[PDB]
Design a protein around this ligand. Sequence first.
Ligand code: NA
Length: 166
Amino acid sequence: ARIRAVQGDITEFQGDAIVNAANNYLKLGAGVAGAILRKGGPSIQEECDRIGKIRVGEAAVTGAGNLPVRYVIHAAVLGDEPASLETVRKATKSALEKAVELGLKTVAFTALGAWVGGLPAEAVLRVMDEEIKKAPDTLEVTGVHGTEKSAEAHRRALLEHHHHHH
Ligand code: NA
């Protein structure tokens, strides 16, 4: 599946959906997540409550509130257990399967850069990418970076990839 890389606000992504890294209890915290709750609205966390706990590595779909997308796909990367490049690969494929299930066409993930927290940012991007490139080409995946710097580097990695087909 294709990948575009841009600096910007994920809350301002226009498309079928946006993927939200989450804890398996579906409790949206601060930072980007809270921003999604803010711009999105109460209804999002409400649906997350209706669903309840899920497994780390799995995904859950939710309406996107006032956001310019139809759904918000929640992918549990941690909660019952710490986040790992292992739990991320899973949360990604899981979110990618939901996208396919709902017949989505334009989905956007977020590249937290230095805000990745526990795992080495570069490696998380790699793992997420590996999974995405396996997803159906009926998808148009967009990586939204917080900084232009990290986005440009990502694009260069995407170019270096094409040019060689690593
Ligand atoms: Na994401």
